[PDB]
Amino acid sequence: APLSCGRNGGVCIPIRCPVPMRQIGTCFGRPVKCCRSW
């Protein structure tokens, strides 16, 4: 689905998750991902 990160509750960062933030889901499919500290 588009956007995504709603159920996960995180931000949609493209490319890869920037540390120390950890990935917590995906966004727009596989191009963007969800990233959160907790």
mmCIF file with all atom_site columns, N, CA and C in Angstrom:
data_model
loop_
_atom_site.group_PDB
_atom_site.id
_atom_site.type_symbol
_atom_site.label_atom_id
_atom_site.label_alt_id
_atom_site.label_comp_id
_atom_site.label_asym_id
_atom_site.label_entity_id
_atom_site.label_seq_id
_atom_site.pdbx_PDB_ins_code
_atom_site.Cartn_x
_atom_site.Cartn_y
_atom_site.Cartn_z
_atom_site.occupancy
_atom_site.B_iso_or_equiv
_atom_site.pdbx_formal_charge
_atom_site.auth_seq_id
_atom_site.auth_comp_id
_atom_site.auth_asym_id
_atom_site.auth_atom_id
_atom_site.pdbx_PDB_model_num
ATOM 1   N N  . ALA A 1 1  ? 0.865  -1.211 0.000  1.00 0.00 ? 1  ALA A N  1
ATOM 2   C CA . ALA A 1 1  ? 0.000  0.000  0.000  1.00 0.00 ? 1  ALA A CA 1
ATOM 3   C C  . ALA A 1 1  ? 0.887  1.242  0.000  1.00 0.00 ? 1  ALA A C  1
ATOM 4   N N  . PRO A 1 2  ? 0.318  2.343  -0.406 1.00 0.00 ? 2  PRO A N  1
ATOM 5   C CA . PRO A 1 2  ? 1.032  3.629  -0.467 1.00 0.00 ? 2  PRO A CA 1
ATOM 6   C C  . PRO A 1 2  ? 1.124  4.243  0.929  1.00 0.00 ? 2  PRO A C  1
ATOM 7   N N  . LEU A 1 3  ? 2.075  5.116  1.137  1.00 0.00 ? 3  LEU A N  1
ATOM 8   C CA . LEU A 1 3  ? 2.238  5.765  2.470  1.00 0.00 ? 3  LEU A CA 1
ATOM 9   C C  . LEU A 1 3  ? 2.665  4.719  3.500  1.00 0.00 ? 3  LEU A C  1
ATOM 10  N N  . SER A 1 4  ? 1.739  3.941  3.994  1.00 0.00 ? 4  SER A N  1
ATOM 11  C CA . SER A 1 4  ? 2.084  2.902  5.000  1.00 0.00 ? 4  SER A CA 1
ATOM 12  C C  . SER A 1 4  ? 2.606  3.581  6.269  1.00 0.00 ? 4  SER A C  1
ATOM 13  N N  . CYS A 1 5  ? 3.188  2.823  7.164  1.00 0.00 ? 5  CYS A N  1
ATOM 14  C CA . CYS A 1 5  ? 3.716  3.413  8.432  1.00 0.00 ? 5  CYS A CA 1
ATOM 15  C C  . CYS A 1 5  ? 2.560  3.871  9.330  1.00 0.00 ? 5  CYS A C  1
ATOM 16  N N  . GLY A 1 6  ? 1.335  3.612  8.951  1.00 0.00 ? 6  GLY A N  1
ATOM 17  C CA . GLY A 1 6  ? 0.194  4.037  9.803  1.00 0.00 ? 6  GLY A CA 1
ATOM 18  C C  . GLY A 1 6  ? 0.046  3.049  10.955 1.00 0.00 ? 6  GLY A C  1
ATOM 19  N N  . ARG A 1 7  ? -0.096 1.792  10.646 1.00 0.00 ? 7  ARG A N  1
ATOM 20  C CA . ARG A 1 7  ? -0.231 0.774  11.720 1.00 0.00 ? 7  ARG A CA 1
ATOM 21  C C  . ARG A 1 7  ? 1.072  0.720  12.513 1.00 0.00 ? 7  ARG A C  1
ATOM 22  N N  . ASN A 1 8  ? 2.184  0.801  11.837 1.00 0.00 ? 8  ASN A N  1
ATOM 23  C CA . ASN A 1 8  ? 3.492  0.763  12.546 1.00 0.00 ? 8  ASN A CA 1
ATOM 24  C C  . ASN A 1 8  ? 3.632  2.026  13.392 1.00 0.00 ? 8  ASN A C  1
ATOM 25  N N  . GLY A 1 9  ? 3.208  3.143  12.870 1.00 0.00 ? 9  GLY A N  1
ATOM 26  C CA . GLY A 1 9  ? 3.316  4.411  13.638 1.00 0.00 ? 9  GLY A CA 1
ATOM 27  C C  . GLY A 1 9  ? 4.762  4.898  13.599 1.00 0.00 ? 9  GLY A C  1
ATOM 28  N N  . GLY A 1 10 ? 5.285  5.142  12.430 1.00 0.00 ? 10 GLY A N  1
ATOM 29  C CA . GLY A 1 10 ? 6.691  5.620  12.331 1.00 0.00 ? 10 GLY A CA 1
ATOM 30  C C  . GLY A 1 10 ? 6.817  6.558  11.133 1.00 0.00 ? 10 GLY A C  1
ATOM 31  N N  . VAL A 1 11 ? 8.016  6.933  10.779 1.00 0.00 ? 11 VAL A N  1
ATOM 32  C CA . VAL A 1 11 ? 8.191  7.843  9.614  1.00 0.00 ? 11 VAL A CA 1
ATOM 33  C C  . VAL A 1 11 ? 8.621  7.024  8.396  1.00 0.00 ? 11 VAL A C  1
ATOM 34  N N  . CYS A 1 12 ? 8.271  7.470  7.222  1.00 0.00 ? 12 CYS A N  1
ATOM 35  C CA . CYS A 1 12 ? 8.644  6.716  5.993  1.00 0.00 ? 12 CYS A CA 1
ATOM 36  C C  . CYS A 1 12 ? 9.953  7.261  5.420  1.00 0.00 ? 12 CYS A C  1
ATOM 37  N N  . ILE A 1 13 ? 11.059 6.670  5.774  1.00 0.00 ? 13 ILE A N  1
ATOM 38  C CA . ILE A 1 13 ? 12.360 7.146  5.237  1.00 0.00 ? 13 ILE A CA 1
ATOM 39  C C  . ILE A 1 13 ? 12.739 6.286  4.027  1.00 0.00 ? 13 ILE A C  1
ATOM 40  N N  . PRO A 1 14 ? 13.061 6.943  2.945  1.00 0.00 ? 14 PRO A N  1
ATOM 41  C CA . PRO A 1 14 ? 13.446 6.268  1.694  1.00 0.00 ? 14 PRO A CA 1
ATOM 42  C C  . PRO A 1 14 ? 14.888 5.763  1.776  1.00 0.00 ? 14 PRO A C  1
ATOM 43  N N  . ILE A 1 15 ? 15.351 5.112  0.741  1.00 0.00 ? 15 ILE A N  1
ATOM 44  C CA . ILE A 1 15 ? 16.743 4.578  0.728  1.00 0.00 ? 15 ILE A CA 1
ATOM 45  C C  . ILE A 1 15 ? 16.912 3.548  1.853  1.00 0.00 ? 15 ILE A C  1
ATOM 46  N N  . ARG A 1 16 ? 17.374 3.943  3.009  1.00 0.00 ? 16 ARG A N  1
ATOM 47  C CA . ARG A 1 16 ? 17.536 2.954  4.110  1.00 0.00 ? 16 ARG A CA 1
ATOM 48  C C  . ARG A 1 16 ? 17.331 3.646  5.454  1.00 0.00 ? 16 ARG A C  1
ATOM 49  N N  . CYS A 1 17 ? 17.220 2.885  6.504  1.00 0.00 ? 17 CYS A N  1
ATOM 50  C CA . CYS A 1 17 ? 17.022 3.495  7.845  1.00 0.00 ? 17 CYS A CA 1
ATOM 51  C C  . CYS A 1 17 ? 18.354 4.058  8.343  1.00 0.00 ? 17 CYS A C  1
ATOM 52  N N  . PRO A 1 18 ? 18.354 5.329  8.641  1.00 0.00 ? 18 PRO A N  1
ATOM 53  C CA . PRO A 1 18 ? 19.550 6.025  9.137  1.00 0.00 ? 18 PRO A CA 1
ATOM 54  C C  . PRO A 1 18 ? 19.745 5.732  10.624 1.00 0.00 ? 18 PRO A C  1
ATOM 55  N N  . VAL A 1 19 ? 20.894 5.248  11.000 1.00 0.00 ? 19 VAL A N  1
ATOM 56  C CA . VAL A 1 19 ? 21.136 4.946  12.436 1.00 0.00 ? 19 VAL A CA 1
ATOM 57  C C  . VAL A 1 19 ? 21.199 6.261  13.216 1.00 0.00 ? 19 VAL A C  1
ATOM 58  N N  . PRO A 1 20 ? 20.979 6.173  14.503 1.00 0.00 ? 20 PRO A N  1
ATOM 59  C CA . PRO A 1 20 ? 20.683 4.904  15.194 1.00 0.00 ? 20 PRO A CA 1
ATOM 60  C C  . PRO A 1 20 ? 19.201 4.516  15.056 1.00 0.00 ? 20 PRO A C  1
ATOM 61  N N  . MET A 1 21 ? 18.455 5.180  14.210 1.00 0.00 ? 21 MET A N  1
ATOM 62  C CA . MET A 1 21 ? 17.017 4.823  14.061 1.00 0.00 ? 21 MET A CA 1
ATOM 63  C C  . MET A 1 21 ? 16.906 3.396  13.525 1.00 0.00 ? 21 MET A C  1
ATOM 64  N N  . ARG A 1 22 ? 15.957 2.646  14.010 1.00 0.00 ? 22 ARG A N  1
ATOM 65  C CA . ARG A 1 22 ? 15.798 1.245  13.534 1.00 0.00 ? 22 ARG A CA 1
ATOM 66  C C  . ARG A 1 22 ? 14.563 1.154  12.639 1.00 0.00 ? 22 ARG A C  1
ATOM 67  N N  . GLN A 1 23 ? 14.574 0.261  11.687 1.00 0.00 ? 23 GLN A N  1
ATOM 68  C CA . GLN A 1 23 ? 13.400 0.125  10.785 1.00 0.00 ? 23 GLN A CA 1
ATOM 69  C C  . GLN A 1 23 ? 12.252 -0.535 11.547 1.00 0.00 ? 23 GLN A C  1
ATOM 70  N N  . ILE A 1 24 ? 11.044 -0.116 11.295 1.00 0.00 ? 24 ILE A N  1
ATOM 71  C CA . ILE A 1 24 ? 9.881  -0.717 12.005 1.00 0.00 ? 24 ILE A CA 1
ATOM 72  C C  . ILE A 1 24 ? 8.723  -0.902 11.021 1.00 0.00 ? 24 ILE A C  1
ATOM 73  N N  . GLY A 1 25 ? 9.013  -1.312 9.818  1.00 0.00 ? 25 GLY A N  1
ATOM 74  C CA . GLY A 1 25 ? 7.928  -1.508 8.817  1.00 0.00 ? 25 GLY A CA 1
ATOM 75  C C  . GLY A 1 25 ? 8.417  -1.023 7.454  1.00 0.00 ? 25 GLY A C  1
ATOM 76  N N  . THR A 1 26 ? 7.538  -0.915 6.497  1.00 0.00 ? 26 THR A N  1
ATOM 77  C CA . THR A 1 26 ? 7.968  -0.446 5.153  1.00 0.00 ? 26 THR A CA 1
ATOM 78  C C  . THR A 1 26 ? 7.023  0.658  4.672  1.00 0.00 ? 26 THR A C  1
ATOM 79  N N  . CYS A 1 27 ? 7.392  1.361  3.636  1.00 0.00 ? 27 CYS A N  1
ATOM 80  C CA . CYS A 1 27 ? 6.516  2.449  3.124  1.00 0.00 ? 27 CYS A CA 1
ATOM 81  C C  . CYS A 1 27 ? 6.520  2.429  1.595  1.00 0.00 ? 27 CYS A C  1
ATOM 82  N N  . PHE A 1 28 ? 5.384  2.657  0.989  1.00 0.00 ? 28 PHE A N  1
ATOM 83  C CA . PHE A 1 28 ? 5.306  2.654  -0.502 1.00 0.00 ? 28 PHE A CA 1
ATOM 84  C C  . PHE A 1 28 ? 5.830  1.327  -1.052 1.00 0.00 ? 28 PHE A C  1
ATOM 85  N N  . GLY A 1 29 ? 5.745  0.273  -0.292 1.00 0.00 ? 29 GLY A N  1
ATOM 86  C CA . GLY A 1 29 ? 6.247  -1.034 -0.790 1.00 0.00 ? 29 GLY A CA 1
ATOM 87  C C  . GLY A 1 29 ? 7.670  -1.262 -0.280 1.00 0.00 ? 29 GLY A C  1
ATOM 88  N N  . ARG A 1 30 ? 8.597  -1.496 -1.168 1.00 0.00 ? 30 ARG A N  1
ATOM 89  C CA . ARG A 1 30 ? 10.000 -1.751 -0.735 1.00 0.00 ? 30 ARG A CA 1
ATOM 90  C C  . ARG A 1 30 ? 10.952 -0.539 -0.934 1.00 0.00 ? 30 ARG A C  1
ATOM 91  N N  . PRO A 1 31 ? 10.558 0.503  -1.651 1.00 0.00 ? 31 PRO A N  1
ATOM 92  C CA . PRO A 1 31 ? 11.458 1.656  -1.863 1.00 0.00 ? 31 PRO A CA 1
ATOM 93  C C  . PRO A 1 31 ? 11.596 2.480  -0.581 1.00 0.00 ? 31 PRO A C  1
ATOM 94  N N  . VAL A 1 32 ? 10.517 2.739  0.099  1.00 0.00 ? 32 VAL A N  1
ATOM 95  C CA . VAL A 1 32 ? 10.612 3.525  1.357  1.00 0.00 ? 32 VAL A CA 1
ATOM 96  C C  . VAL A 1 32 ? 10.417 2.573  2.535  1.00 0.00 ? 32 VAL A C  1
ATOM 97  N N  . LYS A 1 33 ? 10.916 2.911  3.691  1.00 0.00 ? 33 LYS A N  1
ATOM 98  C CA . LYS A 1 33 ? 10.754 1.997  4.856  1.00 0.00 ? 33 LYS A CA 1
ATOM 99  C C  . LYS A 1 33 ? 10.314 2.790  6.085  1.00 0.00 ? 33 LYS A C  1
ATOM 100 N N  . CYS A 1 34 ? 9.833  2.114  7.090  1.00 0.00 ? 34 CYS A N  1
ATOM 101 C CA . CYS A 1 34 ? 9.401  2.817  8.328  1.00 0.00 ? 34 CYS A CA 1
ATOM 102 C C  . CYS A 1 34 ? 10.587 2.883  9.283  1.00 0.00 ? 34 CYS A C  1
ATOM 103 N N  . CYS A 1 35 ? 10.791 3.994  9.930  1.00 0.00 ? 35 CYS A N  1
ATOM 104 C CA . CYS A 1 35 ? 11.946 4.100  10.861 1.00 0.00 ? 35 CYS A CA 1
ATOM 105 C C  . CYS A 1 35 ? 11.496 4.737  12.174 1.00 0.00 ? 35 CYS A C  1
ATOM 106 N N  . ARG A 1 36 ? 11.881 4.164  13.282 1.00 0.00 ? 36 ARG A N  1
ATOM 107 C CA . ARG A 1 36 ? 11.485 4.743  14.593 1.00 0.00 ? 36 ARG A CA 1
ATOM 108 C C  . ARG A 1 36 ? 12.564 4.427  15.624 1.00 0.00 ? 36 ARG A C  1
ATOM 109 N N  . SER A 1 37 ? 12.634 5.192  16.674 1.00 0.00 ? 37 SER A N  1
ATOM 110 C CA . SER A 1 37 ? 13.660 4.931  17.715 1.00 0.00 ? 37 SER A CA 1
ATOM 111 C C  . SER A 1 37 ? 13.171 3.812  18.636 1.00 0.00 ? 37 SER A C  1
ATOM 112 N N  . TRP A 1 38 ? 11.888 3.740  18.862 1.00 0.00 ? 38 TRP A N  1
ATOM 113 C CA . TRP A 1 38 ? 11.344 2.675  19.746 1.00 0.00 ? 38 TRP A CA 1
ATOM 114 C C  . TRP A 1 38 ? 10.389 1.805  18.937 1.00 0.00 ? 38 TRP A C  1
#
